[PDB]
Amino acid sequence: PKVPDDIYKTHLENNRFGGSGSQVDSARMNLASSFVNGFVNAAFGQDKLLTDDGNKWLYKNKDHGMLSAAASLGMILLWDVDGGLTQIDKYLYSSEDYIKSGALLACGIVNSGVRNECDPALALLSDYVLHNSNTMRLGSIFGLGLAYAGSNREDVLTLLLPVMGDSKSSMEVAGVTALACGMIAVGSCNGDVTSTILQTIMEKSETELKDTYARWLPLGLGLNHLG
Amino acid sequence: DRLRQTENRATRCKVERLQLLLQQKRLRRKARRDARG
Amino acid sequence: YSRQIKQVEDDIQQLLKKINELTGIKESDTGLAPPALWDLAADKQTLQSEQPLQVARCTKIINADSEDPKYIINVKQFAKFVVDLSDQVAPTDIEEGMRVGVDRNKYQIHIPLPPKIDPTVTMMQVEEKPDVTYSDVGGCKEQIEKLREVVETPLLHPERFVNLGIEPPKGVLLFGPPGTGKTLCARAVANRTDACFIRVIGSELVQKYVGEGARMVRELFEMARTKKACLIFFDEIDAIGGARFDDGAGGDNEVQRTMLELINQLDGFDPRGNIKVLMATNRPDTLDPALMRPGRLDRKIEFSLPDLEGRTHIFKIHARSMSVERDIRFELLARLCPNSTGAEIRSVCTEAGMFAIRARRKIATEKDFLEAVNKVIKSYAKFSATPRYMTYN
């Protein structure tokens, strides 16, 4: 069925073992609630206002959680490129950068492994790749590489090349940019190798502190051509 | 707030155009199958 | 090359057998595991088993007391005396019928008090579901649905029952032809369940002494009521109680006490509540009417011998695996065996496959199924276990 929603609701038997129940009162568990409407909604389910638990929580706290729910929406309509855009549209118009970025990531997720003649992933995500902030800037590109991974199109790859050449403070963003560029193409990639190694010398050579820096730019070099 | 209103209006007209093109392509695909069967 | 085949592999596999043994130098346990993993915590986390925690042997609570705690403690038979244990937990966890970890001189509280039960009933939970489904049980579909709405929606969503304000039925008997019937669909029930599935075979409850069966029934009901909902299966209740028929010298009282006390336990004075029980036997006419009372035996699932359609369906069910020349005549096979039971039918297909593999064949034929059925149903017709048991007498 479209709404099984049971394994979360299976957590009913364990409450009366060890004494009193309902001791779980944290907020991070609501993140798991995303997957409760997220993971089950794979294989072509639908949640018409059943993401309301995610909706008001997207209006409650956790900026990263708003991004999380809005990205989990793209798991919903995986491979439904023609119907999924109409369900995501309502979030592209959000007053929250986290929800809008998660809706851009959802548009990327829906196209992952499907080459549609209308290029709706490239055509919607392009305008956000160099965006002023980060929610729409950083997450503006991850779905596009997911949409255009196997369809290794170099034209939009060139469009995301100057993000390495942005030279802005992108300590988290340039790393995931190397993830997204390598997602399109890694290994024997002419522009992606050069852009990463030059940016590595430009910032990461003078500061090598945390694994955010040099665990994503090495992923952009040769993971696709590992065979 | 004005920049975001111009941005969301540009996005809208891009999405409304993409939905029309996807629907037109989907109808052409279907018309080929329904003519083969 | 052929007789020379045995010159390349040995030169490396014997060497393999040398280095694998040379790595295998952590063995000869006789009460151990690989000590790189057995004694993986062979550091100080061994010494903290000694100095932080001390013995704290078991105990038994006897009686409470006013104001300051001064509870009375049994050990097991050692001594029966009054202390206050300690102060690291609030004095509200002490109830009679419980066991604390208590020292011999300091009498520390240590942990709160769990109940003590027989290890046999802990072993008696099966925690394994056989690989049988609700699809591979055909011939009793209305029996199937009658047991579907006993062990599902109470286990699933209760809002329907709450909305209609109706308490679900509890006591359900499932019964059928002797030999073919309730057991394998009970395995299917245990397959499709989620909570615990406590097995009870009726023959084991009889003990050397008198009244122990009452004690283990009390213990199993207590450990069942530790759970929110749990399933109880009963097999061959005919031996665990027929009827109170005592005359002159006492006859079969030792089991009578057990059956009557479980009858007291099922009905009256704050019952198990959310515990679903079910029983299956071999002869129903000999059961006691008090056990037959509704509230303990509300539903009466009765399986009969399938007429034709169930026979055709079970012929489908057991025989999707053997080789045949495409076409079959399974319906005429079922017509050939009118009064035939399901395990008999599976035996027929088994012996047909055995006849096929007699000399060299790989696919049985229609005449092979004929050779199965005639030497099953009308060559072993002398016993067949049916006639004195279809009257259940």
Ligand SMILES: Nc1ncnc2c1ncn2[C@@H]1O[C@H](COP(=O)(O)OP(=O)(O)OP(=O)(O)O)[C@@H](O)[C@H]1O
């Ligand atoms: N509907 C059915 N479809 C297929 N096989 C069935 C069906 N009903 C019974 N059987 C067969 O019954 C056999 C075992 O019967 P089962 O033991 O469950 O019956 P019973 O009445 O509980 O008797 P007993 O436990 O005393 O043998 C199995 O071989 C199984 O294939």
